[PDB]
One Martini backbone bead per residue (centre of mass of N, CA, C, O) as a GRO file, in nm:
protein
  307
    1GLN     BB    1   7.307  11.437   3.100
    2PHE     BB    2   7.615  11.625   3.103
    3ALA     BB    3   7.966  11.628   3.178
    4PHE     BB    4   8.273  11.794   3.236
    5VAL     BB    5   8.607  11.651   3.245
    6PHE     BB    6   8.939  11.741   3.384
    7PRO     BB    7   9.260  11.674   3.362
    8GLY     BB    8   9.579  11.590   3.490
    9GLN     BB    9   9.846  11.483   3.583
   10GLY     BB   10   9.947  11.215   3.339
   11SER     BB   11   9.782  11.287   3.056
   12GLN     BB   12  10.022  11.347   2.912
   13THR     BB   13  10.158  11.358   2.566
   14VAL     BB   14  10.339  11.317   2.309
   15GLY     BB   15  10.113  11.436   2.054
   16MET     BB   16   9.882  11.562   2.163
   17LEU     BB   17   9.611  11.656   1.954
   18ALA     BB   18   9.698  11.622   1.661
   19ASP     BB   19   9.431  11.542   1.519
   20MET     BB   20   9.256  11.781   1.609
   21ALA     BB   21   9.434  12.003   1.479
   22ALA     BB   22   9.391  11.890   1.183
   23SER     BB   23   9.063  11.957   1.212
   24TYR     BB   24   9.129  12.223   1.417
   25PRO     BB   25   9.252  12.542   1.422
   26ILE     BB   26   9.176  12.635   1.722
   27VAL     BB   27   9.403  12.488   1.865
   28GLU     BB   28   9.660  12.650   1.774
   29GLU     BB   29   9.539  12.924   1.849
   30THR     BB   30   9.525  12.861   2.149
   31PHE     BB   31   9.833  12.796   2.183
   32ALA     BB   32   9.923  13.086   2.094
   33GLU     BB   33   9.813  13.233   2.337
   34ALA     BB   34   9.975  13.082   2.552
   35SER     BB   35  10.262  13.133   2.438
   36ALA     BB   36  10.248  13.440   2.474
   37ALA     BB   37  10.222  13.414   2.790
   38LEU     BB   38  10.498  13.232   2.826
   39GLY     BB   39  10.748  13.256   2.599
   40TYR     BB   40  10.659  12.989   2.436
   41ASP     BB   41  10.616  12.689   2.243
   42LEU     BB   42  10.370  12.481   2.339
   43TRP     BB   43  10.303  12.305   2.102
   44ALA     BB   44  10.589  12.201   2.047
   45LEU     BB   45  10.622  12.069   2.313
   46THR     BB   46  10.382  11.861   2.273
   47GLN     BB   47  10.498  11.740   1.989
   48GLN     BB   48  10.831  11.705   2.066
   49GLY     BB   49  10.936  11.776   2.326
   50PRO     BB   50  11.043  11.615   2.551
   51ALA     BB   51  10.900  11.438   2.797
   52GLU     BB   52  11.070  11.573   3.028
   53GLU     BB   53  10.956  11.856   2.973
   54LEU     BB   54  10.640  11.790   2.980
   55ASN     BB   55  10.676  11.673   3.296
   56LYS     BB   56  10.715  11.949   3.393
   57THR     BB   57  10.482  12.103   3.585
   58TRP     BB   58  10.517  12.407   3.476
   59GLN     BB   59  10.441  12.274   3.185
   60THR     BB   60  10.216  12.073   3.209
   61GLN     BB   61   9.985  12.259   3.302
   62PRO     BB   62   9.953  12.450   3.057
   63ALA     BB   63   9.923  12.220   2.855
   64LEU     BB   64   9.656  12.101   2.972
   65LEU     BB   65   9.479  12.352   2.980
   66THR     BB   66   9.500  12.409   2.675
   67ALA     BB   67   9.391  12.147   2.566
   68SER     BB   68   9.110  12.172   2.708
   69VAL     BB   69   9.028  12.448   2.588
   70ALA     BB   70   9.047  12.362   2.295
   71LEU     BB   71   8.825  12.145   2.312
   72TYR     BB   72   8.601  12.331   2.406
   73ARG     BB   73   8.615  12.519   2.158
   74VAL     BB   74   8.530  12.311   1.954
   75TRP     BB   75   8.259  12.236   2.067
   76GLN     BB   76   8.140  12.527   2.048
   77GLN     BB   77   8.195  12.589   1.748
   78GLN     BB   78   8.018  12.312   1.667
   79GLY     BB   79   7.746  12.350   1.870
   80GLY     BB   80   7.779  12.280   2.152
   81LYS     BB   81   7.657  12.218   2.449
   82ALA     BB   82   7.639  12.283   2.758
   83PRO     BB   83   7.707  12.162   3.042
   84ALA     BB   84   7.575  12.101   3.356
   85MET     BB   85   7.879  12.032   3.444
   86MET     BB   86   8.192  12.068   3.632
   87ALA     BB   87   8.521  11.899   3.655
   88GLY     BB   88   8.860  11.883   3.809
   89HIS     BB   89   9.190  11.741   3.837
   90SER     BB   90   9.328  11.982   3.986
   91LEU     BB   91   9.426  12.126   3.729
   92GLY     BB   92   9.136  12.085   3.600
   93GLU     BB   93   8.995  12.309   3.761
   94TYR     BB   94   9.101  12.540   3.588
   95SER     BB   95   8.977  12.455   3.325
   96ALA     BB   96   8.685  12.476   3.418
   97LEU     BB   97   8.701  12.782   3.498
   98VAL     BB   98   8.748  12.875   3.211
   99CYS     BB   99   8.495  12.743   3.072
  100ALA     BB  100   8.305  12.900   3.297
  101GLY     BB  101   8.429  13.211   3.307
  102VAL     BB  102   8.620  13.291   3.556
  103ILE     BB  103   8.892  13.268   3.393
  104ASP     BB  104   9.122  13.389   3.213
  105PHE     BB  105   9.311  13.219   3.006
  106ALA     BB  106   9.587  13.364   3.031
  107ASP     BB  107   9.585  13.382   3.335
  108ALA     BB  108   9.578  13.067   3.378
  109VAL     BB  109   9.843  12.998   3.244
  110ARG     BB  110  10.016  13.162   3.440
  111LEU     BB  111   9.911  13.043   3.703
  112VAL     BB  112   9.999  12.733   3.650
  113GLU     BB  113  10.291  12.788   3.626
  114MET     BB  114  10.326  12.897   3.916
  115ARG     BB  115  10.212  12.654   4.060
  116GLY     BB  116  10.438  12.459   3.962
  117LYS     BB  117  10.672  12.613   4.093
  118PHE     BB  118  10.576  12.609   4.386
  119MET     BB  119  10.567  12.300   4.395
  120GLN     BB  120  10.865  12.231   4.318
  121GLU     BB  121  10.984  12.417   4.576
  122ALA     BB  122  10.868  12.311   4.846
  123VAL     BB  123  11.076  12.065   4.826
  124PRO     BB  124  11.328  11.878   4.827
  125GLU     BB  125  11.459  11.665   4.655
  126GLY     BB  126  11.385  11.359   4.835
  127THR     BB  127  11.154  11.430   5.050
  128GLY     BB  128  10.929  11.317   4.876
  129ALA     BB  129  10.613  11.124   4.820
  130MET     BB  130  10.426  10.879   4.626
  131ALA     BB  131  10.127  10.653   4.663
  132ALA     BB  132   9.949  10.377   4.547
  133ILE     BB  133   9.646  10.256   4.681
  134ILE     BB  134   9.534   9.914   4.639
  135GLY     BB  135   9.251   9.776   4.784
  136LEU     BB  136   9.154  10.007   4.996
  137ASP     BB  137   8.985  10.162   5.223
  138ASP     BB  138   8.973  10.485   5.306
  139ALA     BB  139   8.992  10.449   5.619
  140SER     BB  140   9.236  10.257   5.646
  141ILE     BB  141   9.432  10.466   5.523
  142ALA     BB  142   9.412  10.700   5.721
  143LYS     BB  143   9.508  10.527   5.961
  144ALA     BB  144   9.779  10.441   5.847
  145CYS     BB  145   9.878  10.736   5.832
  146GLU     BB  146   9.852  10.819   6.121
  147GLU     BB  147  10.040  10.595   6.241
  148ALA     BB  148  10.295  10.674   6.041
  149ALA     BB  149  10.385  10.965   6.085
  150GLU     BB  150  10.546  11.062   6.344
  151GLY     BB  151  10.571  11.390   6.274
  152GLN     BB  152  10.519  11.359   6.008
  153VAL     BB  153  10.397  11.354   5.665
  154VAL     BB  154  10.083  11.174   5.594
  155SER     BB  155   9.834  11.141   5.323
  156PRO     BB  156   9.560  11.156   5.157
  157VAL     BB  157   9.541  11.307   4.808
  158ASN     BB  158   9.377  11.083   4.636
  159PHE     BB  159   9.034  11.025   4.550
  160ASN     BB  160   8.958  10.828   4.269
  161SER     BB  161   8.859  10.551   4.393
  162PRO     BB  162   8.745  10.272   4.492
  163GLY     BB  163   9.068  10.140   4.540
  164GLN     BB  164   9.195  10.442   4.459
  165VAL     BB  165   9.476  10.581   4.635
  166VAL     BB  166   9.663  10.863   4.714
  167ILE     BB  167   9.971  10.914   4.873
  168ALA     BB  168  10.151  11.171   5.077
  169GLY     BB  169  10.489  11.302   5.161
  170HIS     BB  170  10.716  11.193   5.343
  171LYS     BB  171  10.901  10.937   5.250
  172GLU     BB  172  10.910  10.770   5.519
  173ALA     BB  173  10.601  10.782   5.575
  174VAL     BB  174  10.515  10.649   5.305
  175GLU     BB  175  10.644  10.384   5.372
  176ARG     BB  176  10.495  10.314   5.631
  177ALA     BB  177  10.209  10.337   5.507
  178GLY     BB  178  10.229  10.126   5.298
  179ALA     BB  179  10.287   9.888   5.483
  180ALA     BB  180  10.022   9.920   5.644
  181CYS     BB  181   9.835   9.877   5.410
  182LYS     BB  182   9.921   9.597   5.348
  183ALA     BB  183   9.856   9.496   5.639
  184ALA     BB  184   9.543   9.584   5.588
  185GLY     BB  185   9.505   9.462   5.263
  186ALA     BB  186   9.647   9.571   5.031
  187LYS     BB  187   9.724   9.494   4.709
  188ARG     BB  188   9.876   9.778   4.676
  189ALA     BB  189  10.196   9.991   4.693
  190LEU     BB  190  10.275  10.226   4.459
  191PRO     BB  191  10.547  10.386   4.349
  192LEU     BB  192  10.599  10.707   4.230
  193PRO     BB  193  10.696  10.969   4.009
  194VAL     BB  194  10.730  11.209   4.201
  195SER     BB  195  10.818  11.415   4.453
  196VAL     BB  196  10.577  11.601   4.453
  197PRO     BB  197  10.368  11.646   4.748
  198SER     BB  198  10.066  11.665   4.684
  199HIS     BB  199   9.791  11.746   4.889
  200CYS     BB  200   9.960  11.834   5.138
  201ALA     BB  201  10.103  12.009   5.401
  202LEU     BB  202  10.369  12.069   5.229
  203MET     BB  203  10.194  12.298   5.050
  204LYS     BB  204  10.142  12.547   5.200
  205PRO     BB  205  10.365  12.767   5.123
  206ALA     BB  206  10.266  12.750   4.832
  207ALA     BB  207   9.972  12.843   4.883
  208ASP     BB  208  10.049  13.126   4.991
  209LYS     BB  209  10.168  13.212   4.718
  210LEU     BB  210   9.922  13.163   4.541
  211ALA     BB  211   9.731  13.361   4.678
  212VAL     BB  212   9.877  13.616   4.579
  213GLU     BB  213   9.820  13.564   4.277
  214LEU     BB  214   9.509  13.526   4.276
  215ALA     BB  215   9.442  13.821   4.376
  216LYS     BB  216   9.529  13.954   4.090
  217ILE     BB  217   9.278  13.798   3.978
  218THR     BB  218   9.004  13.779   3.800
  219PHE     BB  219   8.674  13.681   3.913
  220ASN     BB  220   8.402  13.510   3.786
  221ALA     BB  221   8.108  13.396   3.728
  222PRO     BB  222   7.973  13.108   3.665
  223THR     BB  223   7.795  12.946   3.391
  224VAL     BB  224   7.886  12.676   3.531
  225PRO     BB  225   7.903  12.434   3.739
  226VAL     BB  226   8.169  12.383   3.990
  227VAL     BB  227   8.323  12.111   4.130
  228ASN     BB  228   8.517  12.096   4.401
  229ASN     BB  229   8.787  11.925   4.542
  230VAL     BB  230   8.779  12.004   4.854
  231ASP     BB  231   8.434  12.024   4.906
  232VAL     BB  232   8.219  11.955   4.694
  233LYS     BB  233   8.160  12.250   4.561
  234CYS     BB  234   7.947  12.512   4.414
  235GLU     BB  235   8.090  12.789   4.359
  236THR     BB  236   8.034  13.163   4.289
  237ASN     BB  237   8.225  13.310   4.450
  238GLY     BB  238   8.509  13.435   4.353
  239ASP     BB  239   8.647  13.426   4.644
  240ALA     BB  240   8.572  13.126   4.704
  241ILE     BB  241   8.727  12.998   4.473
  242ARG     BB  242   9.001  13.095   4.540
  243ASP     BB  243   9.010  12.960   4.827
  244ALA     BB  244   8.980  12.669   4.700
  245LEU     BB  245   9.259  12.675   4.555
  246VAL     BB  246   9.435  12.697   4.796
  247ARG     BB  247   9.329  12.446   4.956
  248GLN     BB  248   9.379  12.235   4.737
  249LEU     BB  249   9.700  12.211   4.755
  250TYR     BB  250   9.679  12.080   5.082
  251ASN     BB  251   9.443  11.890   4.985
  252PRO     BB  252   9.238  11.658   4.899
  253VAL     BB  253   9.113  11.496   4.620
  254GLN     BB  254   8.753  11.457   4.566
  255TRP     BB  255   8.665  11.259   4.324
  256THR     BB  256   8.468  11.047   4.407
  257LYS     BB  257   8.257  11.257   4.533
  258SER     BB  258   8.221  11.428   4.276
  259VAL     BB  259   8.096  11.206   4.101
  260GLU     BB  260   7.861  11.147   4.294
  261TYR     BB  261   7.743  11.431   4.284
  262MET     BB  262   7.674  11.443   3.986
  263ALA     BB  263   7.488  11.202   3.984
  264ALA     BB  264   7.287  11.330   4.200
  265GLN     BB  265   7.217  11.567   3.974
  266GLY     BB  266   7.173  11.376   3.689
  267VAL     BB  267   7.415  11.277   3.574
  268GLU     BB  268   7.511  11.031   3.301
  269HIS     BB  269   7.766  11.179   3.160
  270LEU     BB  270   8.122  11.173   3.092
  271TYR     BB  271   8.337  11.410   2.951
  272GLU     BB  272   8.675  11.406   2.849
  273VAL     BB  273   8.849  11.726   2.838
  274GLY     BB  274   9.122  11.565   2.719
  275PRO     BB  275   9.380  11.383   2.749
  276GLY     BB  276   9.307  11.078   2.751
  277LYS     BB  277   9.144  10.812   2.996
  278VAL     BB  278   9.138  10.840   3.311
  279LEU     BB  279   8.854  10.945   3.402
  280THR     BB  280   8.697  10.743   3.243
  281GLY     BB  281   8.802  10.485   3.404
  282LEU     BB  282   8.686  10.575   3.692
  283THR     BB  283   8.372  10.604   3.674
  284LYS     BB  284   8.257  10.306   3.714
  285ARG     BB  285   8.402  10.266   3.992
  286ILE     BB  286   8.211  10.475   4.130
  287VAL     BB  287   7.962  10.455   3.903
  288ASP     BB  288   7.826  10.190   3.728
  289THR     BB  289   7.590  10.373   3.568
  290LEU     BB  290   7.801  10.534   3.453
  291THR     BB  291   7.921  10.717   3.178
  292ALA     BB  292   8.218  10.734   2.956
  293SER     BB  293   8.415  10.975   2.756
  294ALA     BB  294   8.626  11.101   2.513
  295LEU     BB  295   8.740  11.441   2.356
  296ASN     BB  296   9.041  11.388   2.164
  297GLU     BB  297   8.892  11.290   1.899
  298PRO     BB  298   8.738  11.367   1.620
  299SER     BB  299   8.523  11.139   1.605
  300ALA     BB  300   8.419  11.170   1.891
  301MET     BB  301   8.336  11.459   1.850
  302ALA     BB  302   8.135  11.402   1.630
  303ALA     BB  303   7.953  11.194   1.783
  304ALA     BB  304   7.862  11.400   2.002
  305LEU     BB  305   7.739  11.625   1.807
  306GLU     BB  306   7.504  11.425   1.710
  307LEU     BB  307   7.330  11.392   1.982
   0.00000   0.00000   0.00000
């Protein structure tokens, strides 16, 4: 049995899905739906860039959601069976919820554009930072962050695998926390092209704004289980899923535990339904007997549909 996993920010690149679109018209048709909802040509953005535009998060997010939904649509069109379960990394959670029939596609495109805007405006540029902590155990990192906070905010915001954890918060506190992580024996603490300090307390007021928008949108029952980032739970109540998306924004993404959870449910393979191979690469580091592969090139898509 397999699950579909859907990537988030960082997985975009200019030119992504070009080959798939050339093999499958439903890709650009899907992007045309999104672009009608957005009021600009999203496909052209993804194909032409420039990178700096594609990397602006209120454009990144709809771009990624659309890419993932397009790939799902190809799978389904070509006779692919539904996965046993779905999960997505931050933005990817929205993609999963669309593919699982919870949120209308166009609604979700508009939603994640607004999500990105709320996120971008959360704090002044130069206020926040993110850092990747490499080669330290989850607990040591949380403690380093606690000690380092000193009435600012800093906390683990992505648990991506054992020994790969992103922290975020106020710039100064993220500096202190990095240093402490190093001191605690971390192999690296790499500063990221952040700005937006996602998935920590700094995102509260953004989350409160998101809540207001989410409430306007119809949520349906999922047709396939979606493991959520915040609680590692498969909610089915439309209104519980909504609430989990609000809480998602200012709480850590529990990716490590979500992958463990899927494995525990009997999932044996993760297909990454989106551009890049980021979640694919995480998989074996979380559960070494799990396999993963991406479904963003025609041939790979073909090979999977043969199974």
